[PDB]
Amino acid sequence: SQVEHPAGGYKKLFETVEELSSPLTAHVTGRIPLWLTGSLLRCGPGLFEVGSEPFYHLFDGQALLHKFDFKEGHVTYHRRFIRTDAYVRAMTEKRIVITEFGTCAFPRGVEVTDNALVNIYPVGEDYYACTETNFITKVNPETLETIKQVDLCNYVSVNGATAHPHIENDGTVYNIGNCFGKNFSIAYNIVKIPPLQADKEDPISKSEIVVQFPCSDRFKPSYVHSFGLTPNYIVFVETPVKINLFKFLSSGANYMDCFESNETMGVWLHIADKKRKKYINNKYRTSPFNLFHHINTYEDHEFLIVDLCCWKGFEFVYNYLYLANLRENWEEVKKNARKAPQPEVRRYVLPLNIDKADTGKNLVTLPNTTATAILCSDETIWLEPEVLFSGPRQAFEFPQINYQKYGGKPYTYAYGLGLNHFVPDRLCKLNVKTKETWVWQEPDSYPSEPIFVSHPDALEEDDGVVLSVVVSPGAGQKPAYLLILNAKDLSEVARAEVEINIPVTFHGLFKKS
Amino acid sequence: SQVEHPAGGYKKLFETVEELSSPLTAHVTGRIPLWLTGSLLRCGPGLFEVGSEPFYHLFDGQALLHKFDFKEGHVTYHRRFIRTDAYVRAMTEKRIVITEFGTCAFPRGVEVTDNALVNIYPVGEDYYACTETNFITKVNPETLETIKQVDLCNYVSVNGATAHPHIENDGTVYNIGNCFGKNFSIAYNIVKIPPLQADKEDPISKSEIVVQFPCSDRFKPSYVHSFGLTPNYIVFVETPVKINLFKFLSSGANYMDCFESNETMGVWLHIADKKRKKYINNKYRTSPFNLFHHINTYEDHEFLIVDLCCWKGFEFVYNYLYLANLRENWEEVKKNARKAPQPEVRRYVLPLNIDKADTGKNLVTLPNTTATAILCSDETIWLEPEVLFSGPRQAFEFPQINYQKYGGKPYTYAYGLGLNHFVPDRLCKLNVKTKETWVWQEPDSYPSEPIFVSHPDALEEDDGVVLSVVVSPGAGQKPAYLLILNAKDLSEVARAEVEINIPVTFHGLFKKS
Ligand SMILES: [Fe+2]
Ligand SMILES: [Fe+2]
């Protein structure tokens, strides 16, 4: 179970690469399924230094857009840097011009980064690469050309937005960002972008605030990375990782310098009625953790099931993700993670109906969970999770599901990237009911978030494949490849090898063609 | 996994029986191991009503002492009521005379029960049956005669004592009970009874207070059921189940009426240096749970590993253990448990060395756990467990280990009784490192706490058997039997059937002969 990486091949995930001018034909081993037709689109950093000025953090390198195309069993690979302000101005001036998450730039107002290195998602007929700021970047998903920059503040009152909007079957987009909501107060706004309507105009110009969540601290919003969505409810988790706005507006500093941990609050969970557009005043509380990715959320009788990838503790996990740390040799990478928060997959169960006559008791009356929710006299509901996966410094992270058909609904399976002291080195499948797992790994191979693609005529939940981009440096070996696994048991079906390196990618999607 | 008991045979665990005048030869099926030589001694209630006056709670029925003897593959069974004050006076007066845990008796000073229905343990050359009060009862382990009543208050300043003293290899006994310790204050005392010394006098007359733990509340001690012991440390867990002494001394009421839950404190964990006899001022804190049984505790580098059978929530679990509830039909037993705390086996890891320079970080630097301990600025150490077993209303309870050789030391295996909505219906083995489990169960069979007995030539931790007393009522069937399982995989080795019923038993021991 404890796998070692003494060769240090994971360092290639963080080495600069060049863009291609046209797509590259990939060498196929095994058999690419013939129904797999479309484009795997993924974002990540590709330039980790501008000349002699280095980027310091994992989330600083300049956005590179990757694409693997699949048709009739053949595969191509293409990549282009996103022509953002951050990238363009850095190429023009031959230096780092915009301040990135953990890299301050040396020398009009505050120039917020639009380095869209995190994720890509559809709004209407368009696709937008994003990071976590107010700026998103329209891209062409066939050529990978950078179409335009969009400033979300032109359309709605929010200071940022997550790279994990939820998208319903009709194309309706929901997302969360903090704002200066009320009188002398901070809040978090849920924005809804409708699908493309008859009049064919930009759906973003029809953005609106659906509902607002209160903040635990008047002047300090929590860092929100993702959130939960069901047909009827929105779920938001407020962690003790706080953004100090006073400290940001003072400054030259970077984004990381403005984060702090609130030691006493623990985690507050909030639910809103999605259709009635109304915050529900249920004071759900639990112990402290970092949270980046919701796995999935759904309704079961009068309860919300909330599956989370947690990190136990209140220190901000991103402190362990500086490039210097991740480029260290293996023994030192392990040492660096010794005092880090511990990863754990957790199921929380939130009762929707709080009856006073149950004060002091466990309200989770469901038959198939060990999660609990205690109603206290002060009207807080204290929650304990059911643990679904727990491995020592072995994270099930970057979770993916059969989203289109089981997102926001009762489900059984999640796929994830396994992180070993923060270094990605395996792919995982988790049965969230039985807790059985499947694993894929090979020595000296470092994979990316697995994306699920259904067989188009699937009736079962895991009838399909997962795709992952893998780096595998070494003598007598192709430096990278696209991996295709059978979603049933994570056995290898095919892989598509390329002869150039591919750096780390965070998120992406499969666009059926 | 969800086993049903529509026939309601579990009710026989709570039906009055008669004592025997001499031992009964048991009918053997399979093969009793020839090295198994000695006496299985177990305590439990055997009289659930005095004439027409009923006892109400599981911990009220009058103490019955059971014994299965093993020699050269043959088995006898014997049982006698313990001639306590509670029992004797009830037979004399033809009514309930002493107030039991959940049964008040109708008409100075305060007459505290000596109903020794819980456990039996050795002190020097003697054996004592006990409950949780200041009165313990010397018994003869061969004849099952009741020798004498001992009032612990004659020897040491404590108001009670648990039924789970720890006993070292040399015979030294440690235990915990609360006391009016300091000025205007409550505390908990650790008492040590030495082994039988040269002068041959009663070791109890040489009892002494080793160390004292402070209380979270000035006038309200927590209910303490058991505690942890290693070669060098004592571990005590202070739960939010509190005893209200003011409410007790006011009263006619019973013991149960004086319990309450503190909603805000959570759980406080305390450690004392055993050899230097000194409380260590480390403020370990975690979320609320009920706790009855420590599984085992041990030292690993500079950390205490603390394995616990927990119930998630602060409502007192004993509220669900009234005889009326446990005698209900199956569907109503399940309904009654719907809002109960959820059982969970948990490993906590307590750092012994708290360095201020790690404030805000996880101090658990061990490689093979996901347990964490966060050092806060206010100097509390917040703890999160590693979950070892978690099943919906399915408790791994009444834990036992290879105590003599692995108690207080690094270990791998625990055995337990599986409770299904509080009804015992299976036997379990847990590998505390890998989390693999083994299960024994048969329809309509309701077993007792499994006791481990080692093979004389054992090379490994689980080389031996577990013994359990099982009730199995029904047509064409022996109403009860002693079950012998192989500790390796919990496969059946033998059983020793008797033709009379055997009610529920709580704890006991095997006395090698
Ligand atoms: Fe993310
Ligand atoms: Fe007990």
Residues of B whose CB is below 8 A from A376? 263
Q: Which of B259, B361, B419 to mutate to test the interface with A (most CBs of A within 10 A)?
A: B361
Q: Please tell me the distance in Å from A486's CA to the nearest CA on chain B.
A: 27
- Determine contact, residues A207/A193, Cβ cutoff 8 Å: yes
Å from CA of B126 to ligand 2 middle: 21
d(CA B396, CA B177): 26
What does R_g of chain A's alpha carbons equal in angstroms? 22
Distances (CA, A) of A177 to A11, B134, B355, B377: 33, 61, 38, 30
The verdict on a CB contact (< 8 Å) between A312 and B384 is yes
**Token code pair at residue A211:** 């509902």
Distances (CA, A) of A8 to A200, A322, A476, B486: 51, 16, 17, 47
Of the candidates B306, B320, B302, B420, the one whose C-alpha atom is nearest the C-alpha of residue B363 is B302
| Cis omega (within 30 of 0) for bond into A109 | no
Cβ burial, residue A499 (10 Å; 0-12/13-18/19+): exposed
Q: Which residues pair with A312 in a beta bridge?
A: A289, A342
> CA-nearest residue of chain A to B360?
A315
Q: Please tell me the distance in Å from B152's CA to the nearest CA on chain A.
A: 35
The verdict on a CB contact (< 8 Å) between A374 and B313 is yes
**Token code pair at residue B464:** 């031996």
Give the phi and the psi of residue A326 in degrees, each rounded to 5: -70, -20
Tell me the CB-side half-sphere exposure of residue B506, using CA atoms within 13 A: 24
Supply the range of the domain harboring residue A350: 1-513
The amino acid occupying position B390 is S
Q: How many interface pairs between A and B have CB atoms less than 8 angstroms apart?
A: 107
The verdict on a CB contact (< 8 Å) between B387 and A390 is yes
Cβ burial, residue B294 (10 Å; 0-12/13-18/19+): buried
Q: Is A204 helix (H, G, I), strand (E, B) or coil?
A: helix
Of the candidates A119, A127, A40, the one whose C-alpha atom is nearest the C-alpha of residue A75 is A40
Cβ burial, residue B472 (10 Å; 0-12/13-18/19+): buried
Residues of B whose CB is below 8 A from A343? 370
| Helical residues (DSSP H) of B66-127, grouped into ranges | 85-93
DSSP symbols for B427-439: EEEEETTT--EEE
Q: Is A131 helix (H, G, I), strand (E, B) or coil?
A: coil
**Token code pair at residue A37:** 């037709």
Q: Which residue has the tokens 């003293």?
A: B165
d(CA B43, CA B507): 6
Q: Which of A354, A374, A432 to mutate to test the interface with B (most CBs of B within 10 A)?
A: A374
Residues of A whose CB is below 8 A from B387? 387, 390
Give the phi and the psi of residue A14 in degrees, each rounded to 5: -120, 30
d(CA A223, CA A351): 25
Of the candidates B240, B262, B236, the one whose C-alpha atom is nearest the C-alpha of residue B350 is B236
This structure's resolution (angstroms)? 2.5
Q: Which residue has the tokens 């733990």?
A: B213
Q: Please tell me the distance in Å from A202's CA to the nearest CA on chain B.
A: 46
d(CA A498, CA A3): 26
- Determine contact, residues A371/A365, Cβ cutoff 8 Å: no
d(CA A40, CA A160): 26
Plot region of B204 (φ>0 → left; ψ -120 to 50 → alpha; else → beta):
alpha
d(CA A35, CA A512): 10
d(CA B150, CA B99): 19
**Token code pair at residue B504:** 């529920």
Q: Please tell me the distance in Å from A367's CA to the nearest CA on chain B.
A: 7
- Determine contact, residues A167/A142, Cβ cutoff 8 Å: no
Which residues, in sequence order, are CB contacts of B477 under 8 Å at separation 6+? none
d(CA A141, CA B195): 80
The verdict on a CB contact (< 8 Å) between A339 and B365 is yes
The amino acid occupying position B358 is D
d(CA A464, CA B68): 59
Residues of A whose CB is below 8 A from B283? none
Ligand number nearest CA of B294 is 2
Which residues, in sequence order, are CB contacts of B330 under 8 Å at separation 6+? B4, B5, B6, B8
- Determine contact, residues A80/A65, Cβ cutoff 8 Å: yes
d(CA A222, CA A216): 8
- Determine contact, residues B8/B444, Cβ cutoff 8 Å: no
Which residue in the set B286, B371, B376 is minimally distant from A263, CB to CB? B376
Element containing residue A508 per DSSP (H, E): strand A508-512
DSSP symbols for B249-267: HH----SGGGEEE-SS--E
Ligand number nearest CA of A291 is 1
**Token code pair at residue A275:** 């259709």
> CA-nearest residue of chain B to A240?
B360
> CA-nearest residue of chain B to A393?
B370
Q: What is the DSSP letter of B154?
A: G
Give the phi and the psi of residue A511 in degrees, each rounded to 5: -100, 105
- Determine contact, residues B121/B133, Cβ cutoff 8 Å: no
Binding site per annotation, positions of A for Fe cation: 164, 225, 293, 507
State whether the Cα torsion A199-A203-A207-A213 is positive or negative. Answer: positive
d(CA A245, CA A243): 6
**Token code pair at residue A385:** 């999770």
Number of domains in chain A: 1
- Determine contact, residues B230/B408, Cβ cutoff 8 Å: yes
The amino acid occupying position B403 is Y
Of the candidates B305, B126, B104, the one whose C-alpha atom is nearest the C-alpha of residue B203 is B126
Is residue B455 a known part of a binding site? no
Longest dimension (CA), chain A: 70
